[PDB]
Subunit: 74 residues, 7 copies
């Protein structure tokens, strides 16, 4: 299901489906996962940005730098 | 655990419940399903805690190793 | 549209197109993407630094250091 | 202790009680079982302290090196 | 004026010309760019530090470490 | 062309280690590497000048160091 | 200074007074004696400042490069 040595496959298993991205310092994105690399840089389509639990705006496409990521959940 | 391989502690916890303490004093409890040398890891049936209070439940979650303070089997 | 393993093709796809940049510390920039590298260092032309939706400064061209970027939205 | 390798101080503390001080004013105590060059390390019968008082017991724990301020063998 | 893959070449375009350096913590420096490396470490001559639009210090020659930089503009 | 020598010339001597967050340590330099990770003996931690705690031996990670004064 | 060698600025400042601005806004002033590519450096007769006023006097101090904002000869 998730190769015990490849945690990032969890992202692969979720391509083109809705995911939750928790960022550092209270930000969060919810959108369709379209792409990602080993650094966890990733692209979401039709994404909503949330700050402190509230929606700030919706972005057609967004590239998130992996270094700002805390966790990802399908 | 080889005195030169701290990560072996992780391998010895695969499929077993663990507590992940993140920076910013955030906490996660769940079943360790995967991990790499950077300590990125996947938990199943996970729960996010805040002051001993579950604030979120996730069936599966990928945690970046850079934000981890400690992992307790 | 973007290769599932190359999140950066989203930037390649946006060369010479308007983009929004969100930096750590909440600073925000808008401009025409002209260049970028794997570190996400990038150059914008006709850039505008924003705050509360207000343009607090304009720069004909600016080089932004990638390590300060949270996200980029084409 | 080789003046060319301070980590030897860790090697000399293997299986002995140590004190770990993390950034953010967090502190741990327990038996050192393993560690690497990054200073990631495992403690057994570990305890987390706050003002000298023991807040919680974690048993086995893997601590990431990047969060360490100092280690008192 | 810069290769789409070489954003740092924007620095080369400013050599011996005045530039504006914005650092973390909302600090700004202006001076003539004299040198720079791949880390964005750079040296300014006749440098001045600004705040609210006014020079708060005159530093003359100064070496600025790249990891503190947010952006650079001609 | 090698500042790390300054430390070498201080081996077995009392030094002052100033860390980030305004924390300060004083002890006898016993060992150190290129990353500036170092070991102090009879180390003393202090705040506002007053010693807060004592450590017979401590390993300090270089990445937390602001400066070292012999 | 060579347009490709920013470090020459330090070379040209050896045995000369310099101002070191550190992250956390601390300020140090003293005579530059040595430095490496990582910008670690040694100052003689260093003085620490705060809001423009001295705080401490040091005879010799080694400053780690990673904490530096800028160095002004």
């Amino acid at each position: 299901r998730v190769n015990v040595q490849r945690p990032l496959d969890a992202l692969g298993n979720s391509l083109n489906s809705p995911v939750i991205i928790k960022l550092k310092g209270d930000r969060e994105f919810r959108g369709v996962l379209k792409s990602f690399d080993l650094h966890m840089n990733l692209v979401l389509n039709d994404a909503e940005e949330l700050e402190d639990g509230e929606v700030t705006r919706r972005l057609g496409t967004v590239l998130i730098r992996g270094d700002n990521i805390v966790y990802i959940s399908p």
